[PDB]
């Protein structure tokens, strides 16, 4: 039953058992009905944490693999371990990208969720791009095209302070910086999104969306990071 599966996802979330949480939400998604905003959040939280664990482990072990040139046994072990983590990571990404293509993007009936899922597609292809090595070209272009479509829709459909629009700009700037090694484009995109939001906020007498404060902080701080 869907409500049982959703209740279980919420338990798993509280317990920080994200592999459990993701299995529940995969199952819900596969029932084929458009997700509620609550269910969409549960799906996204679960898989962001599942994949994030593997990405973090991959970065550490890939760094060690690089550092051990000349240490034949240690480098082979680090390589094999990096490949095992990378296999998990590719499997998670492909699962998410299959859900997006089979269920989530097609069933999206409002612009907000369309942008959210196209952004997610950009994200999980980006995570594949972090580890891919030719194969990579196509993965990069799938990420860019998903992000670009989301971006265009968000500019027509969402205020500058909308957290999905801002979170999209944030991740799309990271794509340019990290995947395309295009730091000028990354900084331009991030600064423009921040500036448009500040301009809106400067015309408002009420508070805007509470989740956008966090995203604006990260936009600003990436710009500082990227300009050392």
């Amino acid at each position: 039953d869907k409500n049982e599966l959703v209740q279980k996802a919420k338990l798993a979330e509280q317990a920080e058992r994200y592999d459990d949480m993701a299995a529940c939400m995969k199952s819900v998604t596969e029932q084929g009905a458009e997700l509620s905003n609550e269910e969409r959040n549960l799906l996204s939280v679960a898989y962001k944490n599942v994949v994030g664990a593997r990405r973090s482990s991959w970065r550490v072990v890939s760094s060690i693999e690089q550092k051990t040139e000349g240490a034949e046994k240690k480098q082979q072990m680090a390589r094999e371990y990096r490949e095992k983590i990378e296999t998990e990571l590719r499997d998670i990404c492909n699962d998410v990208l299959s859900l997006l293509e089979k269920f989530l993007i097609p069933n999206a009936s409002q612009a907000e969720s369309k942008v959210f899922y196209l952004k997610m597609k950009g994200d999980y292809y980006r995570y594949l791009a972090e580890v891919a090595a030719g194969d990579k070209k196509g993965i990069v272009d799938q990420s860019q095209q998903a992000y670009q479509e989301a971006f265009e829709i968000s500019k027509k459909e969402m205020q500058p302070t909308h957290p999905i629009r801002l979170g999209l700009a944030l991740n799309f700037s990271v794509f340019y910086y990290e995947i395309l090694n295009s730091p000028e484009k990354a900084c331009s995109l991030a600064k423009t999104a921040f500036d448009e939001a500040i301009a809106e906020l400067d015309t408002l007498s009420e508070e805007s969306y509470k989740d956008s404060t966090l995203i604006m902080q990260l936009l600003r701080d990436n710009l500082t990071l990227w300009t050392s």
Binding site: K48, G167, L170, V174, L225
Partner: peptide, 10 residues
């Protein structure tokens, strides 16, 4: 690394 969206809805 860069900071990416924690996709948090409060």
């Amino acid at each position: 690394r860069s900071y990416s969206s924690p996709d948090i809805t409060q």
